[PDB]
């Protein structure tokens, strides 16, 4: 977030399949629709994967 809210805006890339926070960007990648529009089942599965 410090990279993104920055002048110039830093491009960033996330790798998948490893584990932990990168994968909860991956679930914030393929099921996202129009940017940050995230539904309730996916936010709750995300919450329990942070809790696990």
């Amino acid at each position: 977030l410090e990279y993104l809210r920055d002048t110039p805006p830093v491009p960033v890339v996330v790798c998948d399949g490893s584990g932990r926070a990168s994968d909860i960007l991956a679930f914030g990648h393929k099921y996202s629709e129009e940017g940050g529009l995230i539904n309730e089942s996916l936010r709750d599965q995300l919450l329990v994967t942070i809790q696990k």
Binding site: S41, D44, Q45, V48
Partner: peptide
Amino acid sequence: RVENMSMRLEEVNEREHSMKASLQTVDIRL
């Protein structure tokens, strides 16, 4: 038939992804 292996086990893999989401939700539901 290795071509056929690759595509059919691809179907098995994505189907199991749906099954994982369903069973984790069911475990949350119990």
